[PDB]
Amino acid sequence: AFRVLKPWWDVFTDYLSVAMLMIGVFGCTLQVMQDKIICLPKRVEMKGLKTDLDLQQYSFINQMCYERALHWYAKYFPYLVLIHTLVFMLCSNFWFKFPGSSSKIEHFISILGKCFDSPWTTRALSEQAKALFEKVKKFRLHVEEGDILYAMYVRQTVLKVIKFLIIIAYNSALVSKVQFTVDCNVDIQDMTGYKNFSCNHTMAHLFSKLSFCYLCFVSIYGLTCLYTLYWLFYRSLREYSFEYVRQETGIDDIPDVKNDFAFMLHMIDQYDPLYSKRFAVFLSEVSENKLKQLNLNNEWTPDKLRQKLQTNAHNRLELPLIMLSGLPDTVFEITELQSLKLEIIKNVMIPATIAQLDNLQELSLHQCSVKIHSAALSFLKENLKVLSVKFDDMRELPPWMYGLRNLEELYLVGSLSHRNVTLESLRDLKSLKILSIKSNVSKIPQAVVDVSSHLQKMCIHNDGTKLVMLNNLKKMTNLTELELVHCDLERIPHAVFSLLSLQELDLKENNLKSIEEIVSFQHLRKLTVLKLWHNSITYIPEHIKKLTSLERLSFSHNKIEVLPSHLFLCNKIRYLDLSYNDIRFIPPEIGVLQSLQYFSITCNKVESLPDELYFCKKLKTLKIGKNSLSVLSPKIGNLLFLSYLDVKGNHFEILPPELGDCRALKRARLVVEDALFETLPSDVREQMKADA
Amino acid sequence: AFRVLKPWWDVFTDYLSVAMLMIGVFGCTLQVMQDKIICLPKRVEMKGLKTDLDLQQYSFINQMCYERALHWYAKYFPYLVLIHTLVFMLCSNFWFKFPGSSSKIEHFISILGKCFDSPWTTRALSEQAKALFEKVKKFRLHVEEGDILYAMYVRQTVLKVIKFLIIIAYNSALVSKVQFTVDCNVDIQDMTGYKNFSCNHTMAHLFSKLSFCYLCFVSIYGLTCLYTLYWLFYRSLREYSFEYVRQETGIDDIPDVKNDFAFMLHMIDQYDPLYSKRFAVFLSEVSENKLKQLNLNNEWTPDKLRQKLQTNAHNRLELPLIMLSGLPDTVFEITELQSLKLEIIKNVMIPATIAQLDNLQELSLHQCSVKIHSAALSFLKENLKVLSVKFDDMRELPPWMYGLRNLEELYLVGSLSHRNVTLESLRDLKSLKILSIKSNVSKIPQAVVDVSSHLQKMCIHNDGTKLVMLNNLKKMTNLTELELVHCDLERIPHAVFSLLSLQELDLKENNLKSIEEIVSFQHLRKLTVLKLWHNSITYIPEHIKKLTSLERLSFSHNKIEVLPSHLFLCNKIRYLDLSYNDIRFIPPEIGVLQSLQYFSITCNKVESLPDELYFCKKLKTLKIGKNSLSVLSPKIGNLLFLSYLDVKGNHFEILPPELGDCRALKRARLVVEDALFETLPSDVREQMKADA
């Protein structure tokens, strides 16, 4: 604190100053004690020379000739040395005592003491100091733009030099002024009768030697100061470069430091370089990252991870990551999970340690600007089969996923056209079969055709953008199944008819009304499932009877009001969705659809129940919903395989006990009004709720 | 409490004062040791000049001539210097030696240091400081009333300067007064025989030099003090404005400080700008809010939230929040719950993080001034289907909810008419299907018409204000379920007949007496449920028998005493509340009300039971209450499906065992006295209580 700043020569000057003050005080005490110029009158077998002067006269003569004859240097030397040594001490400590420098120095000594103290420094050179990191960077921001400390030190030393020079320059000449004997021609007569006096100065000889001795001190002092001056103008401390500790521990960080930092680090080094090396760590950003990783690993343990382990949508062991900044290493201790979820973790490097986690084929990236390792990338291209990616500003999407070959299913969340898709080529995705698109691109990009060679199912669910050109869609030769949800086509495009291998088609939220292209649909004989959700279809073309291959029909939220009889000409269908439609009556041909196993007319206008409905026993799910039926035909007891029933929201009053014959149907599958359910027999409800 | 108050010039003045003290004390010691006058009689080959004076006479001459001839300043210079230096010390330290100012400055330094050490300062600039914020604001309040510190400091500096002029003024004019030699004509004749004496005191010469040196010191001192004066009249220390820190850290608060606090800031800045910079962060209100939020996040954990996670009245997962400063962010981690209960939480803003909580269809806002994020607003507009708001002064109501379209059920607590109701339009509310109102609307606002297009259910339960106008009610054509609770109508309004789509009707607490408008009610052929709670209805118009669609009837707390036969003609009714009335005898035609499932005559004067009552086996609820009955007809056993019985508070003695036949009626549904219950057979009571 009070020591680590002064190099050897500063303590040298302090010691010389203390010794100099000792010399000066010695001289002062001697002078006060015995300084007695002794005087006699001068002008004149032998006898004495009795001058008959009483003691008072002798003291008076001594005093007078002291003031007159003795040259001022011999009189004033000790106080002079006192002043000079006092000024030297003041100017030595002025660097600390001045507040402008004192603030910076106190800040620096505090921060550097704590930095040298931290054991994480030693660990890195081979837990809470990450705050000291921020303190260090704040401090260097505070003082690097100074250099006033360098100015203060240079001024201090240069004034010391000028003082030493003036001391030698005058004192060398003035030393020879002292004389042991001395003369004085004073007009003391008329009070003693004598005019010409001789005297001897007792201290003279002593002072002479003292001066000489004192002079030696000054000489040494000056040389010391000069060296400092040389050391302050030969190494140019305005800039410092580590270039050794950087090479010592082989970390290319810690580039350089600015002026005041350079100077003060130089000072500390000239005290001891060990403190400089132990300080070198905290400027390293690599050290910062490593300390962050250690701290999070201290916080992140495989226990906590396996606590959060769960199953994804695709029944896979997955660890959610909702809000982080890096990858805890403890996850690399968990090779069992085969899915991984990451939400909004930028600035992430994927290590090769994922190679330990081979048992994984699914990954999730929700707006995470993340890059990979080379071995990590190879591990992805050789192991992963499924990937879900959410992105917002294209920054979270790095290109390397376009190289993953063994991936089989892909999910995308984010707009590309912002209307051409800024989509890279989907060619290296050699094993992809499933593609999920969540964007607003008006056109299907050519990159889709880059994967069409092995693409089996591709799903686009835009936000309402129209698929303006469907030319690339016609290239989906390998496309086994096709979905066009909310593509705003409003019609049946010709591209769909280009895919004979198509099995299941959805046009949800496309608001189709004129669907007379069913003729082209009989061109596609693999069409087993057709879905027309939320479409303005108020009428059903007769060409639907020509699609024998159909197995499932979706027409929820459609303006059909009366279903034509030709609808029933395709008995192969097993699933029938007609809910939220204007349907008011069921034609009896509902009987021929024996293979039907599902039905839904929730929130429709159906008021009557044809009895042929009770002939398709394969119907296991019935959803009347909020319709206008008022009586339930007992023929419901004929449909034993009906497992689900949704008549709630209708005008029934009493439920016939024929519901007791429905073994597949229970209260779980029975959606009825509580009052209507109460009308059922006690035995029926006991058998229906449980085993009675 | 000692260092940072002194800028550089104060330290310089302190050192000059110290060194001046050194000069003075050195002079004092020398004067003690050496200051002797030496005197000789003046007026008179060469010989001695014997004066034949014994030592006593010489000493007496010394005393006399020293007292007379030697000028006082030469005699007292060191003591004068000591006095002036000491006064300088005292007038320098009078700042802190005054207790009133001492408390202020000491507290200032304590809190400033503490603020400097606070790591939360660093975090903000990037735990327990929450307490320190209050101390900070209390202190700034306590000190921004002063400026006595600045005035006293100005007084100190002017005192120092004027004393400096005084010192120079007379020392310059008296320095020449000291003289080595000196003369004295003293009339000591007849006592030592001489009159003219010459003397010299040894110190004179030295003192000259000393004075010169001393002058220089004081001169420099004055110069430094003079600078302070310039520094006290050029910066206008009455005000401090950061405007750089306010720009550096980008925090627009910390406006300014008053003269006293501004002056202290100027001092600290002169010591170091960084102290003031770091201290400014604790004046930020935004920083304080962030600290409060962080602290409540520290106090709250998702486990604590899930501790009170429960079901609401409308069976939804919800967490109570009764009193808070904001949202503990942990709530954003819990997405399963679809409703949140927040009460009396002002200045809350819901971020985009609500989008994490997609499983959401209900909400609660009890007098909470809450703003929203943009993504938050979209999430409310798209996800919510039910919502509860309590507001008091329309400020807790956040207007943006008038823009939510997908909401379907909304309940409001808070007056509107206040009787002009400043209710905003219910137009952007597109998907609403259910509405509850708790206001003071004497008028149905036009805003309801903007939701009447899509309206399905609306319930107004004003605090009793008469809904005088109801033309907007006539615009509720699409309305299906209507309730008018405590609307103080006292009569059947014509607006009700304007709503043919109406299914359920309520006029509770409207205190209707004359209800002869039932004729227009059979205009409403969709009228399923009709309620007449707490009405003054003396009797029953026959037009009620003309309501074909009657299903449920309420006559709670009415002045009805005898009921007519035509009332029973609407056998379609299943619910019949007649309690708290003057009923005494039930006409036997109660039998035709076979479809009736409910009955209540509690707190009436009924004295006999027609047996045709027991014909309506559909009657499952029976609330006789406290009436004037004495015996029970065994035909109650005919009511096998009777599930409830309230006979408590009557005059029975022994009940028929036919109660054992009623399978739906058990001991729990049998509201009876215990002594009377004992009169029943043990088998019946065992069967009712348990399965024996």
From Swiss-Prot, chains A, B:
Point out the gene that encodes the protein: LRRC8C
What reaction does this catalyse?
A: chloride(in) = chloride(out); iodide(out) = iodide(in); taurine(out) = taurine(in); 2',3'-cGAMP(out) = 2',3'-cGAMP(in)
- Identify this protein by name: Volume-regulated anion channel subunit LRRC8C
Q: Where in the cell is it found?
A: Cell membrane; Endoplasmic reticulum membrane
Keywords in alphabetical order:
Cell membrane, Disease variant, Disulfide bond, Dwarfism, Endoplasmic reticulum, Glycoprotein, Intellectual disability, Ion channel, Ion transport, Leucine-rich repeat, Membrane, Phosphoprotein, Repeat, Transmembrane, Transmembrane helix, Transport
**Coiled coil ranges:** none
UniProt source species: Homo sapiens (Human)
Q: How does it assemble?
A: Heterohexamer; oligomerizes with other LRRC8 proteins (LRRC8A, LRRC8B, LRRC8D and/or LRRC8E) to form a heterohexamer. Homoheptamer; inactive, likely because it is not targeted to the plasma membrane in the absence of LRRC8A. In vivo, the subunit composition may depend primarily on expression levels, and heterooligomeric channels containing various proportions of the different LRRC8 proteins may coexist.
Q: Which residues lie on this side of the membrane: Cytoplasmic?
A: 231-689
Q: How does it sit in the membrane?
A: Multi-pass membrane protein
Q: Where is it expressed, tissue-wise? A: Expressed at highest levels in skeletal muscle, and at moderate levels in heart, lung and peripheral blood leukocytes.
**What residue spans do the LRR repeats cover?**
288-311, 312-334, 337-357, 358-379, 381-404, 406-425, 429-451, 453-475, 476-499, 501-523, 524-547, 548-570, 572-593, 594-616, 618-639, 641-662, 664-687
